Design a protein around this ligand. Structure first.
Ligand code: CL
Lengths: 115, 112
């Protein structure tokens, strides 16, 4: 099945419910069920890429699209004071699901370091 | 409005440069928050991700591909975290778009 069988692949195919914000032919934005900020959503490609460390050179446009969609959805959600975008890679990055995802967090002051 | 990152791109002040191409520059952060902490920045002056244009999409992806390749070159085989900060709530320190790449330790949750 297209997208794979991680929870994110299932969400892409409407097999597991999610609170969807935005969808286009390349990606999907939906709210994180364990939010770490007052607003916390994910932008994922529909194409299955397990982790950023294995993304291909020709995935540049798609990865950039995640960020453009993230910033547009953040504006649509009224995050007018700003936000933080995060991609986790692997164990040290805290990556929970092996399907590439961009976190977008806002609605409060984010702190430094970023974890 | 120019920034300190513009000065770094122009080679007017030093930084520990890791990689360069025709459209971006990667260099170690002067205030590292992990054993490895570097930045990938576009040479184009985009002040913040919120004003990035649609035509900038593949350039932004290029920052991430460069970041992941440099992370591998720097031995971050256990993983890493990529961060883009926007505005005051995001903690953005310089108004020139920059991708942070942090690793060499366990990164924690929440991410700030
Ligand atoms: Cl910053």
């Amino acid at each position: 099945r297209p997208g794979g069988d991680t929870i994110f692949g299932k969400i892409i195919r409407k097999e597991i419910p999610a609170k969807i914000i935005f969808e286009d032919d390349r990606c999907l934005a939906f709210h994180d069920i364990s939010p770490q900020a007052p607003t916390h959503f994910l932008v994922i490609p529909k194409k299955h890429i397990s982790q950023i460390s294995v993304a291909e050179d020709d995935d540049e446009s798609l990865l950039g699209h995640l960020m453009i969609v993230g910033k547009k959805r953040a504006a649509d959600l009224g995050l007018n004071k700003g936000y933080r975008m995060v991609v986790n890679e692997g164990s040290d990055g805290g990556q929970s699901v092996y399907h590439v995802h961009l976190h977008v967090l806002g609605g409060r002051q984010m702190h430094w370091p970023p974890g």
